[PDB]
Amino acid sequence: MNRFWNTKKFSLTNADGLCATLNEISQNDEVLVVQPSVLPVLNSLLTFQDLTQSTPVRKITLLDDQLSDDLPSALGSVPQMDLIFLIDVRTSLRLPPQLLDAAQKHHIIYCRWKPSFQNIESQLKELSNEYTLYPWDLLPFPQIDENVLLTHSLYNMENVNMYYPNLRSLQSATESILVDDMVNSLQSLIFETNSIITNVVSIGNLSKRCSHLLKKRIDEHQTENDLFIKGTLYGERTNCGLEMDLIILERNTDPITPLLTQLTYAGILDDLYEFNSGIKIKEKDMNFNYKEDKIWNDLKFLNFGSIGPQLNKLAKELQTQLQQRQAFLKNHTTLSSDVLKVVETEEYGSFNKILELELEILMGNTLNNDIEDIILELQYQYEVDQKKILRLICLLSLCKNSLREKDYEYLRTFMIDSWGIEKCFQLESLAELGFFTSKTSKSTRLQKEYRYISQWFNTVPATFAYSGVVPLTMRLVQMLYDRSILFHNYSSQQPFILSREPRVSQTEDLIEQLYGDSHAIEESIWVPGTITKKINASIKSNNEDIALVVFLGGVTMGEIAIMKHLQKILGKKGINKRFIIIADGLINGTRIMNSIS
Amino acid sequence: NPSFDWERLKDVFYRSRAIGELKWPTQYEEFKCALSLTVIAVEIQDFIQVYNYFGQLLGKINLQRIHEDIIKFEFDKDEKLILVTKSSIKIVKGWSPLTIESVPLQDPTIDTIWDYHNGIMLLAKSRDIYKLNGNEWELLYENKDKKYNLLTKNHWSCNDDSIILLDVDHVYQVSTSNGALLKLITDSSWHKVTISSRGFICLYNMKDNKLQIFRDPARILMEHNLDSTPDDICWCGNDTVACSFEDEIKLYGPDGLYVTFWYPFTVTNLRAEVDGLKVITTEKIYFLSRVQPQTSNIFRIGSTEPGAMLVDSFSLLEDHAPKAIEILKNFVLEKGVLDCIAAAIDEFEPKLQKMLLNAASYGKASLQYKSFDASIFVNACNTIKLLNCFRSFGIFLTVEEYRCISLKGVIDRLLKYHRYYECIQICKLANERFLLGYVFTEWAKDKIKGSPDMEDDELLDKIKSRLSVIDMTDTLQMVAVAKVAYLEGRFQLSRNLALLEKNEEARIEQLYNLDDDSIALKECIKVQNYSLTISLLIALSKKLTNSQLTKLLIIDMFNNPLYLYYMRMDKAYLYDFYRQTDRFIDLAHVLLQQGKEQQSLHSFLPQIKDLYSQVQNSEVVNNTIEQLQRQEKLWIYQESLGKRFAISFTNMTLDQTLSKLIETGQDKQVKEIVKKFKISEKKLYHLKCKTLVEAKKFDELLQFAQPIGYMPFYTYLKSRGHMDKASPYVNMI
């Protein structure tokens, strides 16, 4: 596992899969037709120069509406170079309308998770026969960091958040498709590395459905005999034995954190500009590759207040010393130059205004009658964007468990006046999702004032990811392996202090007051230790611990750097764990509001 | 020593053994008979009886009166009786439910069948060459002028490729794949042919006895001028040619020598197997096999091969144990271990088999640690264990035949006569699982195709009860069982049989093709494979009607809007669906999305107001209509400003429309907006202050200063393009 859970191999394997499949289709020149929602994924695996070398493809086209008259131009190019479509129907269930339409007016590659045990298309039957289907096996490859894997399941071609679809009536099936996609992606990683999953912890109602479905699709595949052979034969490092944590969390467990203003260097760049599937900013672009840009690795998670001063050290270090590094040092200086100037000028600054104002809610300092002037001053005096208020208004409701009826209809009315009648449906979807409610399949939602959370989990004392606030997602993960956070604020009943394995004992009562139910957290154990694990472990012993953290619904870039800090703080305290943050996309405050409607 | 006789021609030994025992000892032997591999079919008056080699009556095809003359009958490859009539050919497919499948000539009005032998058939009047490639006479050779002159029905033969046909003067030939003449010898007076499995052609003259076995023309391999005309010139596998003088079978060989195998009783019929010459007598059946090199070394008299002295060494372990360890060291104990193993399989008697395997296992462990894999020994034991289990069931197979036809061949030959339990043990004994599936599904196929009046309730138990005992997977293939139930018309348990499959894709597909679509859809929810369910629905929509889909969706897919998500791009279908389903809040957002997609919300806005007025079963609905009723006053009042100020006001919010009034400059209309629309005192100040500071040094705020705390007057001036003239507000605070 240590030599097999190497994420860099995933990226190279997927690149080899496309190239191997591409050549066998044809040997003459080819024109690739790439779906717009998958294009940044390919450019993450391989560049244009690399692709043309081992494969005959020379031009890449998009499935947008522009490829209708250009399709006829491509039709002339079709004679010169073969046309091979590239579509992704895993989370859309429907082919791109432009592709099917263009077929009747003038070879398809469909992405698929790596097969598990063996090793939708009737729509095009109306068009014609002799259709060729070459599957492209895919695995979640690292894109932003070595220990971070994204499946890009949160968004389909319309760019609607599958966790928060704009059409509210479809959340019973849009949500459940995402879970089915997570299990298939997780099976791809589990079987490739031949890992054996030990005790599993899940928080939130939707998380349980992902663990149970994963157990069903793993139990139906492997048996006890099939389990003994895998662990013992495959090295198992002969040190401790078997351990595979599968902490599974969903976004609704911690909705406050996406509404906060990010501060990490890769968070601010994600906050101001939208990263895409390939983690490349559209307006100004460079190779945001951790493998290539060695400086990018050391700066992508520091507090933005440190990127500037620490770039002086990096700049002067090359003075005593390279040409490739020479462009890198100035490129990140320019990024720290472009970003820094935008901070104090755009919205009359207000970047420090929002940051200090967020705290005034996170300790309950902002009192009831002050909402009138605070919200009004932002919209008018500072000319701040609508989303930066609608995100801040949602923060008010969550950190006080509700809003008084005097202000709830005030804020709703004020938003209608300042931004039209469309906000009476944006503010309606927020209320149903629990982001902005009042006193007056039942998914989990926060049900407590953030004053209690700040007191209990010490979220407001390591506070570099956000505006001086530890995300509640870190505390939930930390409270399993480390009860020291609770023992100073919520104590006298903690069973232990430090546990190698994730434990949920004597914490179900805490969730009952928190999420409104005591059964939100469940630890359904898998193959039970010395009964099957240590018996297999000690067998090969005589004759670190990967701790996958699945993020259902997207992880903010501030919650990625806060696990790395969490992994380090656990390492010094005895519980040495490696955290692999499997997720399904990047989620921010601006991404949410563009999806809630 | 078993080498009692073990006669040799020139260098190789030949042996005779006893295979089974017959229980006729009557005219049945004289009566016509045929053999394939296990069974013998004799016609006793109008009662054709099929006996195995151990005298067990398996089946009995009484002639259905006659209805057609029965000249001959054989077995092709699978022990299926091929009763041949002057008019047509009637193969046999079942013995308890006798289901003779008659295959007629295409034109049974001019010619007639003259002879049939292993497929290829030959007409009578116009001597054509046909072939049974199924339920038809697939023609192979076309007639011509002077094609052939077979003196008697015993003037031709064929096995799989050559269709050698004996002319009067020449010896012609045909091949199945092409059907062409390949004339061998210009001069010939030959009267018989017994082409073997490999292709070694035989001949005979019967005027001067001139047995002249060949392999190809222009070459002679043997020309023994035997004395008396024989009775049955059979074949000894692939090697030699025998005869049958009275009770005297002589295995002829090279260079004019023969070995005589006298028999107590007369010789009736001879079947040329792959590696034997099964000889039938009135009492028991014999087997003129050929001695392999393994047994020719171990059991030869006065032998000195490594195989022989290992057996001697084992035979001295009983009392001369310190005198039998030295013999092992003398020779090469690698040929001896393998010779015993490869010779124990050949032997039939269990006693020699147990000693030979004892001898090999005795010397097997006197080798290096990894000298050779023991799998050769275990495989030999398993092969011998099976070939002795078949003998208990009446099927006698040598090692060659049990591998020429695999375990499927044995199972097939037993499934014909409804012996399913025996096939169960054989499959278990071989430690196979794929054949175990093929056994069960055939049993379930016949039971459904058998008793037609058996009620569904007890019948479903019978299939389920026997399935539970048998532990196997991927080969049960209940969809084949479901299809058989469907063909019989008992579709009630067809679903029930479909519901007991471990393959989700097959269970859903079979249930769909059975047209129990309501049940098929519901079960697909349990699997929770949303990829599969959405594939069923699009296929379901291909043959159902537009309304019938909706009727199914409402009843069974109420709280599961998956199909709607499949067509979210088609607002047309979702529109009429939601009203007919009588969902009104959900319908509003579809109307809403059209407004935002086409950038026109007013064109839909009053219609949305209508929909929220048809539910009333909520509290947020009363709030939304109020924000809509208040919007109605906002919109109608916009035309009032356009009817008295000649300014466009459409698609402007309350916030934006009040700013426009400050830019132009009004007194009461801005105040009319505030008091009528319930605009707070605070918001009025910032909105005009923001607007005024853009009005290029308006200076009216001093005339306006007469509840923002007097502070933000500075910031609008200070933090914008009005840094100058900020002093008046400095002392104003």
Author numbering:
A (entry chain D): 1 to 106, 112 to 124, 150 to 351, 374 to 492, 502 to 522, 542 to 623, 638 to 691
B (entry chain B): 3 to 708, 713 to 739
Reproduce text from the manuscript describing this model:
At the opposite sites, Vps41 and Vps39 bind to membrane-anchored small GTPases (the Rab7-like Ypt7 in yeast), while Vps16 and the SM protein Vps33 establish the SNARE-binding module.
Here, we used cryo-electron microscopy to reveal the structure of HOPS. HOPS forms a largely extended, slender structure extending approximately 430 Å in height and 130 Å in width, resembling a triangular shape. Vps41 and Vps39 provide the Ypt7-interaction sites at their peripheral N-terminal regions. Vps33 is in immediate contact with the structured loop of Vps18 (residues 824–831) that connects the elongated helix with the RING finger domain.
